[model samples]
Target: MNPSPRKRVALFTDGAALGNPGPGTTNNRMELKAAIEGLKALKEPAEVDLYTDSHYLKKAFTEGWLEGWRKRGWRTAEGKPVKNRDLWEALLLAMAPHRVRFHFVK
Candidate 1:
């Protein structure tokens, strides 16, 4: 029998805020939630090829912006508190065990 053909898989994800940055919703939070949910769906540690439309998400994780935020106690370089820190924290936690590579799409 074949050796299961070296199983492969892919997961796709996205997000949107109804109001998007005013009343009850925001794009930043939605993007973070999308990332969190995507990682949360994994059953175990994985080498993930994550794709997203959010430049903020892709750049933050891939370009080390998130690392800077973490190192700075979740504050921006300007000494201001980062917005959406709660969701950012959750997303970071969700992604901690996985080796993730980000792809940004228009």
Candidate 2:
């Protein structure tokens, strides 16, 4: 399910800081960075197939969670600050130049 076809790009990204993907490291930023850095590298607008096993991030784009979260001024449902607002902002900024589709590459 996509729009009128053009040059499509397949992007695989990940974040690994050891410790079984738990806290104590900048896991969130790393994930967001993987996405941002990959998308930002492209100088042209294309349909992007973003491949990542990241759970919430897939939903963030597909389920409109980024819109929801940004609508709340980068606050979560619990009213706490978004852990990676800066990185997320960078991600959003990078997204405008392209149309990206997400997938869980299991």
Candidate 3:
């Protein structure tokens, strides 16, 4: 069997909005960036090591909060839903674009 020759690129991502007291969702979107933003920034992904932050970001995927959100409904008490499903797919797309990894970051 011929092994396919493909590059394994390790992508690292983070958002710069480390609590500007925007306390609403500006940084939320900022931190949330990596899941979709990484790919959108490239319109692509290539094996990412998603070192990310709080609930609105990486923890969702790693802990299955994202899964529950979709499995339950796009409506919730934890937080409002906008890009839930779309991001879900984009996360998958971004994730699958190369084969990403997670690091439940600080």
Candidate 4:
């Protein structure tokens, strides 16, 4: 008998945020949610790559600053507490569940 074919896949790329520094947390939630939802919608668990231009978001995974916050007591390099801790924690949690390869674009 012949082996079954590999499952077909889909690419779900998206971006969010309002003005990059505006009063918009929904965009972060939406974009992150969209990635997870897309992966969940796939017929089979396949490779997925989530792309974004936000260095902040990319660092959340690659640099893992959020996780460090807990150890550092939320202090920055200059010993100042993080300003966007809520969003940071939220994004960290949102990204923790998936097996995604994040990329940054110019």
Candidate 5:
């Protein structure tokens, strides 16, 4: 039997806090952002896949929902302004430099 070939990809994952709703320092969120940077730093452009447990990060690409959210001035159905717009911007910027596939679950 032959060993399966290894697959290469750039995976990203993130988590957030709502202050009163949770604790501080969102490592997952930070790591996901870092993954984008890590991918950018790659010596060359190769097949890259970014994974995130955060639906918000995934949907940023999956559903193309971020544009709509921005169009709405970053407000949700409940009329609450989106949190962490800075991170949102960073995610978008980081994605600007690669062939990245974003997937979300969990």
Candidate 6:
């Protein structure tokens, strides 16, 4: 028997917002940017263990929040539009071809 061939990679990222509701520079936006860039940095899609300092991003996938929002038409449980839906959508697409495991670090 031959062992399957695969590349295991690690990527670390962190982001922050200047203000809670700033006109520019939001934590969620930064988080998405970091994650997106990390994925894009890979020359080809492969198995990846991505680590982030943001619990929000980690929990979103691990807890199915992202999937729920997408299924709910990008609306929160309260029927409000999900925050940073644009970036979230982009992240999902970027992650489609890669096997990604998310880890949260304090």
Best model number under lDDT: 2
Better of 2 and 3 by lDDT: 2
**How many angstroms is residue 83 displaced in model 3 relative to the true structure, after the best TM-score fit?**
6.4
Order by lDDT, highest first? 2, 6, 1, 5, 3, 4
Root mean square deviation (Cα) for candidate 6: 4.0
Can you write out model 2's per-residue Cα lDDT over 1-106, one digit (the tens) per residue? 5456766887776677554657354554566687788788775788888877666576566667667776788886689897777777887898888887777776
What's model 3's lDDT at 101? 63
Give residue 41's lDDT in candidate 6 (0 to 100): 68
Q: Model 5 segments beyond 4 Å from truth?
A: 1-8, 12-28, 39-46
Candidate 6 TM-score over all chains jointly: 0.75
Error of 6 at 59 (Å): 2.4
lDDT of each: 0.64, 0.72, 0.58, 0.56, 0.59, 0.71
Whole-model lDDT, candidate 6?
0.71
Instruction: Give one digit per residue, the lDDT tens place, for model 3 in 2-105.
Output: 22334334444446565667636546466555557666666443455666655566555666665566676665546676455566567566665555566666
Better of 1 and 5 by lDDT: 1
Off by over 4 Å in 1: 1-9, 20-25
Residues 1-106, candidate 6: write the lDDT tens digits. Answer: 3224466676766565675686264665676688887777674677777777675676677777666676788876678887777777877888887787777776
Query: Model 3 residue 59 lDDT?
Result: 51
**Candidate 3: count of backbone clashes, pairs at least 3 residues apart or interchain:** 0
What total of clashing residue pairs does each candidate reach?
0, 0, 0, 0, 3, 0
Kindly report the root-mean-square deviation of model 3 from the true structure over all alpha carbons. Answer: 4.6
lDDT of 4 by residue, 1-106 (tens): 3223433333444545564565265455556556556655553543445665554556556776656778888877679876566555654555455444666653
Instruction: Give the distance in Å from residue 64's predicted Cα in candidate 5 to where it truly belongs.
Output: 2.6
